[PDB]
Amino acid sequence: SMDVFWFLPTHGDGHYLGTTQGARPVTLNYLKQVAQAADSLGYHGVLIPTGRSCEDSWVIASALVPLTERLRYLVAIRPGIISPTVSARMAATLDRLSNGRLLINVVTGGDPDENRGDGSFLSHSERYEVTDEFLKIWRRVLQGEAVDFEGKHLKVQNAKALYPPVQKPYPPLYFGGSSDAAHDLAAEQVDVYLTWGEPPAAVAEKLADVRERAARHGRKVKFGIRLHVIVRETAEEAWKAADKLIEHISDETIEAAQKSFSRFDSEGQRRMAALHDGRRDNLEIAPNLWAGVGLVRGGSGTALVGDPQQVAARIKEYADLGIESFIFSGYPHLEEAYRFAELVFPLLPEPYASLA
Amino acid sequence: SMDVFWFLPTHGDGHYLGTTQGARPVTLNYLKQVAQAADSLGYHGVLIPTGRSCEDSWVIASALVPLTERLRYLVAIRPGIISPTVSARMAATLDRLSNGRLLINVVTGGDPDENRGDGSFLSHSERYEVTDEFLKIWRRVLQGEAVDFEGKHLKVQNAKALYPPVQKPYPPLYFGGSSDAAHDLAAEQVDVYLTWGEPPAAVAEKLADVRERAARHGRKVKFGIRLHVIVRETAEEAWKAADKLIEHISDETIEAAQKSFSRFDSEGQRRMAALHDGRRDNLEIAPNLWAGVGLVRGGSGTALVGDPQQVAARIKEYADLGIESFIFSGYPHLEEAYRFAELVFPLLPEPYASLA
Amino acid sequence: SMDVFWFLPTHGDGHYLGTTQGARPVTLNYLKQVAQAADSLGYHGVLIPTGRSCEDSWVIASALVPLTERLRYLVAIRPGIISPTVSARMAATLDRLSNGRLLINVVTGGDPDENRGDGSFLSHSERYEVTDEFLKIWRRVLQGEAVDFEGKHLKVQNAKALYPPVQKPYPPLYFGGSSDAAHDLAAEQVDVYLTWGEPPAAVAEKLADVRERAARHGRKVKFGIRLHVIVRETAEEAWKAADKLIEHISDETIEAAQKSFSRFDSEGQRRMAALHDGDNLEIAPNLWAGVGLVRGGSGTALVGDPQQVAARIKEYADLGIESFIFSGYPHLEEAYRFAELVFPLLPEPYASLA
Amino acid sequence: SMDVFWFLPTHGDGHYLGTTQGARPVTLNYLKQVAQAADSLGYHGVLIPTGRSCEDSWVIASALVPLTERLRYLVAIRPGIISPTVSARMAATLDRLSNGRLLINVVTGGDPDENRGDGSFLSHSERYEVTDEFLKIWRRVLQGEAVDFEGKHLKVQNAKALYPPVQKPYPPLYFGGSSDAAHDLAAEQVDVYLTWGEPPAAVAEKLADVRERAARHGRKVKFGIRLHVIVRETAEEAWKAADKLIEHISDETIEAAQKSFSRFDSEGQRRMAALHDGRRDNLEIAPNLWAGVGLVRGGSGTALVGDPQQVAARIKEYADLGIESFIFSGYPHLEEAYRFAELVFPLLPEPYASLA
Numbered sequence A, B, D: 001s002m003d004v005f006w007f008l009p010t011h012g013d014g015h016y017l018g019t020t021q022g023a024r025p026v027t028l029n030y031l032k033q034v035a036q037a038a039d040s041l042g043y044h045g046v047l048i049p050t051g052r053s054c055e056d057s058w059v060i061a062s063a064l065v066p067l068t069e070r071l072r073y074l075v076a077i078r079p080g081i082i083s084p085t086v087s088a089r090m091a092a093t094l095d096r097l098s099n100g101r102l103l104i105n106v107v108t109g110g111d112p113d114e115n116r117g118d119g120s121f122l123s124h125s126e127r128y129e130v131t132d133e134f135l136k137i138w139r140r141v142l143q144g145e146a147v148d149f150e151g152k153h154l155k156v157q158n159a160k161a162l163y164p165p166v167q168k169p170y171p172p173l174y175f176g177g178s179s180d181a182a183h184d185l186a187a188e189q190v191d192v193y194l195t196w197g198e199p200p201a202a203v204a205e206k207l208a209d210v211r212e213r214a215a216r217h218g219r220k221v222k223f224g225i226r227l228h229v230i231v232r233e234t235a236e237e238a239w240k241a242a243d244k245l246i247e248h249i250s251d252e253t254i255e256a257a258q259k260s261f262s263r264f265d266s267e268g269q270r271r272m273a274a275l276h277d278g279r280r281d282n283l284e285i286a287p288n289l290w291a292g293v294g295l296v297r298g299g300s301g302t303a304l305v306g307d308p309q310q311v312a313a314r315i316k317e318y319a320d321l322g323i324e325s326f327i328f329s330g331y332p333h334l335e336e337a338y339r340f341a342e343l344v345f346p347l348l349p350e351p352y353a354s355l356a
Numbered sequence C: 001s002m003d004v005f006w007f008l009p010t011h012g013d014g015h016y017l018g019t020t021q022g023a024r025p026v027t028l029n030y031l032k033q034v035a036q037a038a039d040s041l042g043y044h045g046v047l048i049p050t051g052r053s054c055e056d057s058w059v060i061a062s063a064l065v066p067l068t069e070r071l072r073y074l075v076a077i078r079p080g081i082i083s084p085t086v087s088a089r090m091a092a093t094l095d096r097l098s099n100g101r102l103l104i105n106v107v108t109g110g111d112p113d114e115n116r117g118d119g120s121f122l123s124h125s126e127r128y129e130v131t132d133e134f135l136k137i138w139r140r141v142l143q144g145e146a147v148d149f150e151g152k153h154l155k156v157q158n159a160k161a162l163y164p165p166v167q168k169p170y171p172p173l174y175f176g177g178s179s180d181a182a183h184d185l186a187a188e189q190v191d192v193y194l195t196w197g198e199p200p201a202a203v204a205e206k207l208a209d210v211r212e213r214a215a216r217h218g219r220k221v222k223f224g225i226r227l228h229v230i231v232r233e234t235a236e237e238a239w240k241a242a243d244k245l246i247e248h249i250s251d252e253t254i255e256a257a258q259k260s261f262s263r264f265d266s267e268g269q270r271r272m273a274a275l276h277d278g279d280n281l282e283i284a285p286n287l288w289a290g291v292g293l294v295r296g297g298s299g300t301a302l303v304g305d306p307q308q309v310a311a312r313i314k315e316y317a318d319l320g321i322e323s324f325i326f327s328g329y330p331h332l333e334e335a336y337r338f339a340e341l342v343f344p345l346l347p348e349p350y351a352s353l354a
C-alpha cells in the first residue's frame, strides 16, 4: 500500500533557488498545467501549501477540482484563524464537488509573525489547544451531529453542517509536527502523520513515538513523508542538477534564511535547519539525502538525489519503516512531475508500476 | 448604466416553493449549467447566497470561475467567523484567477442561532462593530499596506496580502442591511448598497437615508435591488405561474417559517415579513409587485409578476430612484434565466437591448 | 433494456416553428448547454444531425467530447463525399478521445440537389452501392486489417487505420431508411435500424421486414425510433403547447416545405410527409404530425401527459424498439422537462436517475 | 513582424528518436497539456500534422479549441480524399467555434501508398490539378458564393456553405511543397508559403522563385519555415542533447527509413533527405543547423542547435530573407515548448520579447 503525491507550487516556481533567473509566476494556467499533469500521470494527489507567501489554498483547490478527474487535493486548514463550523462546510462542499477527492492537512502555524498578521496571538501550547478544540468540532460536525462545545478557546452552540461529505466519516486528516504537543494531537485525532525528510534513523524514532501514544488511545495511524527529489538517468547528471540548483545562492541569503528560521516557533523547522546550520559543504547528510534545498526554502529541506535505482531504494527504506504516503516535488514542478513518473513509477509498487 | 445579475441557487432549486416536488438538487453539473447559462446570455454577474443552508460560497465561485468567460461573481464574506487577512487573501486569489471578475457581498448575519453555530455570540451592535473593524483591515490590506490595527474586536499586527488584486483599489463591496447600524456602515465603507424588493416609495426612503449619511462622510454610493421575477408573454400567464408557485404551501409551513423569522435578528428580514404577515390574501402589495415568495423563502421575498412591458416598466421606476444594479432570480433558475433574457433584455437599456 | 437519446440542434433552435421569433442561434455556448444538460440528466447520448443546413457534425462532436463525461455522440458519416479510410481514422480518433462514447449514424443523402452541391452525382441505387462498398472497407479497416478492395465505385489498396478504436469491433452503426435497398443494407451490415415516428402498425411492419432479412444473414439488429416529444403535466397543457408551436405557420411556408420535399429521393421522407398531406394532425392516439409541417425528417411528436407519453413509449418498446431519440423546442428546456416527467415512468436506469 | 508556432505531436512523442524507450503515447490529456502550454506561453499557434501515422487533425483541433483562449490551430486539408464543399463547411464550423483561430495547411500527399490507401490513384501532376480545382471551390464557397464548377477532376453544382467563417475572406491558407506545380499553386492561391529547414542560401532561392511567380499574378505571399530546435543555456549542453536524441538509433532503422523515403513522390521530402544522405558524420550542414532529425523522422528533418544567442541569430537570418512565420518543435514537446519560450522568446521581436 502506497500513495504517491506531487506538489502544487502556489508560492512560485522556477529552475533555481535563491534567484529570479528562470522563475515562473503562479498563474491559473500554470497551476492548471501542474495539476492536470499530476492527474494524467496517475499521482494519488497533490499537496497544496498554505501561508502568507502562497495564493489561497481553498480557491486554488476548488478551481482545479472540475478540471481534473482522479487527482486528490491535500488542502490545508488553519485552526485559530477560521471558525471550525465554517471550515467544515467548505470541506464538505469541496468533497461533494470533487466526488470524494479532498484530503485535509492540519496546519498549526509555526511563524508567530505570520500568525499575528492573521489576528492570532497564541503561544505554541495555545495553538495546539485551539487545534484540539477545532478538530473535535470539525470532526463531529461533519458526522451530522449538532455540536455544543465550550472550551478554553472555542465556543459553538448548535453547530451543524447540513450537507454531509462524500468520504465517511469525514475527509482524511493529515498532520505534521514534531513537538510533544504535536505528537499527542496526531495520536488522538488525525489519520495520517506526516514528517519531513529526515534520515531513516531519525524518522523511525518519530514514528515509534506516535505509535506508542496512539496505542494508549486504542488507535492506529498511517505515516507519510515529504521529500524533494532530483532524479535523472544517471547519478552524475542528478548531482550536477543539485549543484546547478543552488549555484546562484549568495552567502547573505543563507544567513538571512537561517535567522528567519530561528524566529520560527516550530520544532519541525528547528530540526530541518539543524541538519546543515547554513553550511554549503557536507550537504549529503545520509545516503542519497541532500539538504541543499533547506539553505533557502522554508519547510521541506531535504531531497533524494540519484538514479532511479537509488531513489527507489531510499523510498523502499522509508516504506519498510511503515510510511505509506510519499509527497514529492522538484524544480520546475511541471517537468519534474513527468520525470519522476517516467523514471521511478516502474520501480514502485502497484498501481504505479503499471501506470508507466 | 444598469447591471443585471442572476442568482446561483446554492441552497437548492425547484419548480415549486415549500415542497420537495419537482426539486433540483445542488450538484456541480447543475451549478455549472446555471452559471454558464448566465455567462452566455450576457448577465453582468451572479449573486451567490451564503449561510448554513447553502453550500460554501467560496468553493462554488472558485470552481465556476475557470468555466466562465465574462460573468462576475458576487460572493459573500462573513466578518466575525474568518480572519480579515485570510479573507483578503482569498479575495485577491479569486480576483486574480478570474482576471478581475470578483465582487464582494458583505454579510453580517441575521440569524443568531446560525451565528452561534459558527462560534459568534455577538449582539446586533457588536456584529456591526466587528464588520466595521473587519472591513477597515480588509480594504487596507488589499491596497498593499502592512496593517497594524487594534480595535474592540479585531487585532492584527503586520497583516499583509502579498498578491495584489486585479480590481483597484479592491473588489467592489456590495452590502445589504436595513438597520441604522447597517446604513452607517454602508455610507462609510461600501461601494453599492443593496435592498430587497420593497415598493418604490419605501425604497426611495431607504435610498434617501443612505445618500444623506454618505454625504456626511464625503462619499456617494451606488444602489442595487434584489427581486425575484415571474415574467411570461402575457400577464395572465405570469399571474397563473405565480399562483402555481405557492399552491403546495401548507399553513404549517407558513407558521413554521414566519415564527422562524421572528427569531431572526435582522431589520431587513423584519421589513420583508411585515409586507405579507403570513397571509395568502392581498399578496400584490404594489402594481406587479407580488410578495408570495416571502411566505416561505427567507431574504428576498417579493417578485415582479407581469408581461414583459410591465416588468420592464417596474424596473424603470426603480432605476429612476437611482438604482443601477438589479439582482434577479426565478424558479427554476436555469429555465427562468433564459426566459428573462429573451423576454426582458430587449426592453432594457444597452448592452442588454443588443444582446438578443 | 432501453436507450433514451436527446438531440443537438446544430441547424438552429427556438420556441416556434416557421418563424424567427424567439430563435436561439447555434453557438458553441448553446451547444455546450444542451450537451452538458443531456450528460448530467442521464440521457444515453445525443443524435447530431447532418446536412447543408447544419454545422459540421464531426467538429461539433469533437468539441463537446472533452466537456462531457458519460454522454454518447451519434455522429453521421456520409459515403460518397469522403474517403472511407479517412472516415475510419476520424471515427477512431474521436472514439479514442471519448473513451468509447462514439456512435455512427450512416447517412446516404436524400437530397440530390444537396448531393450535387457536394460533388456526388449518384442515383438512388448508386448511393446504396457506394454505401455498401464504403461500410465493408470501413468495418474491416477499423478491425486492423490492411484492406485491398476494388468495387464498382470505391477502390482502396493497403488501406490501414493504425490507431484501433476503443469499442470493438468498431463503433456501433446506426442506420435509417425505408427502401428495399436500405433494408438489405441494414440486415447485412448495420447494428441498429432507425425509423421515424410512424403509428405503431406501420412501424411494426418495417421491423418485421428487417427481421426476416437479418435472419437470412444470420444476424439480429436492434431497432430505434426518432420522435419529437411535447410533454406537460396535463394533457391540456401539452396540446396547448403543440398549438402554440405551430401558430406562426401560414400556408405559404407549408407549400414551400411540401414543394421542397417533392424533390427528395428518399423513401423515409415521403412516408413521413404523406401522413398530413400539407387539421386532423393527430394521426394516432397521442401521435401528432404537426412537426413535419415544416421540419424535414422527424415529423411526428408524442403529445400528452407523462402517463400517456410513457404508454406510447411502452407500445413501441413491445414491438422490439430499444432506442428512442427524442427532441423538443427549445432543446435545452425540454431535455429537463422530459427527464423530470417521463424518466421516473421508464425502465432502469432512467427510473432511478430522477 | 514574426509569428512563432509550436507543434502538436499527433503522431507520437518521446525523449528519443527511433525507439520506444521513454515514449509518451498520444492521449487526449497529453495533447491538452501541449496545447495549453503553447496557449499560456504566448505562441501564435500550433501546427497539427496530417497523415496515416497521425490521429485525425480535425478531431484533435476541434477537441482543443474550447480548451484554449488565444492559440491558433494550423490544420491540414487533404484535397483528393474529401469533397471541397464538405471541407469548407468543416472549416467554417471550426473557425466559428474558435472565434477566428483556424489556419489552413494545404497538403497534397507525398506518399503514393498512403494515397492509394485513401482511394486516390493520381500522379504528381494530377494531385496538384486536383488541389488547384479544390482550392478554387473552397475559397469561393467560404465567401458566400453558390459555386458552379466543372473542372478536369472536381465537379460541384450549386455548392454552398450556409455558415460564413469569422476570418475574411476565408481562414488563411498555408502551403508547403517544392515542385514546380507546388510553386505555381502557392503563387496563385495561397497566403503563406511554408518550407522546411534547408540552409539559408537554399531557402533564399526558393523564396525568390515564389516571389517571381506571385508577382506575375499580381500577388504577394508571406513565407514561413518549419524547424526543430534543440536549445540549452550553453552550446555544449545543446550538442550533447542533439547527440543523445539519436544515440539509440540502429542502422536497421535508418536503412528501413531511407528506403521508405525513396518511395515518396515529394520534391520537398527528396531535398530534405538529400541534406544528410543517411550518414552519421557531418550532420551540421550549416552553422547551428543539424540534420540528425531527418535520419528517421519523415518531413521536417533539420534542427537549430546551440545556445540562445546562436539560435536567435539563425532565426534572424531566415527573417532577413522575408520569413515571418516560424514553426518549431522539440523532444519532448511539452518540456521543450517551455525551454524555447524561456530561452529564446526574450531574444525575439515583440510580442515575444515581452512575454517572458
Ligand SMILES: Cc1cc2nc3c(=O)[nH]c(=O)nc-3n(C[C@H](O)[C@H](O)[C@H](O)COP(=O)(O)O)c2cc1C
Pocket (backbone or CB within 6 Å): A048, A049, A050, A051, A076, A105, A106, A107, A108, A109, A110, A175, A176, A177, A178, A179, A181, A182, A194, A195, A196, A226, A265, A266, A267, A268, A269
Ligand atoms: C508535510 C508537512 C506539511 C506542512 N505544511 C505546512 C503548510 O502548508 N504551511 C505551514 O505553515 N506549515 C506547514 N507545516 C508545518 C506544521 O504544519 C506547523 O505549521 C508547525 O510547523 C508545527 O509545529 P511543531 O513542529 O513545533 O509541532 C507542515 C509540516 C509538514 C510535516
Ligand SMILES: Cc1cc2nc3c(=O)[nH]c(=O)nc-3n(C[C@H](O)[C@H](O)[C@H](O)COP(=O)(O)O)c2cc1C
Pocket (backbone or CB within 6 Å): B048, B049, B050, B051, B076, B105, B106, B107, B108, B109, B110, B111, B175, B176, B177, B178, B179, B180, B181, B182, B194, B195, B196, B225, B226, B265, B266, B267, B268, B269, B299
Ligand atoms: C441583496 C442582499 C443579499 C443578502 N445576502 C445575504 C446572504 O447571502 N446571507 C445572509 O445571511 N444574509 C444576507 N443578507 C442580509 C444581510 O447581509 C444580513 O444577514 C442582515 O439581514 C442585515 O441585518 P439588518 O437588516 O438588521 O441591518 C442579504 C441582504 C441583501 C439586501
Ligand SMILES: Cc1cc2nc3c(=O)[nH]c(=O)nc-3n(C[C@H](O)[C@H](O)[C@H](O)COP(=O)(O)O)c2cc1C
Pocket (backbone or CB within 6 Å): C048, C049, C050, C051, C076, C105, C106, C107, C108, C109, C110, C175, C176, C177, C178, C179, C180, C182, C194, C195, C196, C225, C226, C265, C266, C267, C268, C269
Ligand atoms: C433516425 C434517422 C436519422 C437520420 N438522420 C439524418 C441526418 O442527420 N441527415 C440526413 O441527411 N439524413 C438523415 N436521415 C435520412 C436517411 O439517413 C437518408 O438520408 C435517407 O432518407 C434514406 O433513404 P431511403 O429512405 O430512400 O431508403 C436519417 C434517417 C433516420 C430514420
Ligand SMILES: Cc1cc2nc3c(=O)[nH]c(=O)nc-3n(C[C@H](O)[C@H](O)[C@H](O)COP(=O)(O)O)c2cc1C
Pocket (backbone or CB within 6 Å): D048, D049, D050, D051, D076, D106, D107, D108, D109, D110, D175, D176, D177, D178, D179, D180, D181, D182, D194, D195, D196, D225, D226, D265, D266, D267, D268, D269, D299
Ligand atoms: C511546413 C510543412 C508542413 C507539411 N505538412 C505536411 C503534413 O501534415 N502531412 C503531409 O502529408 N505532408 C506535409 N507536407 C508536405 C506537403 O504538404 C506535400 O504532402 C508534399 O510532401 C509536397 O510535395 P512536393 O514537394 O513534390 O511539391 C508539409 C510540408 C511543409 C513544408
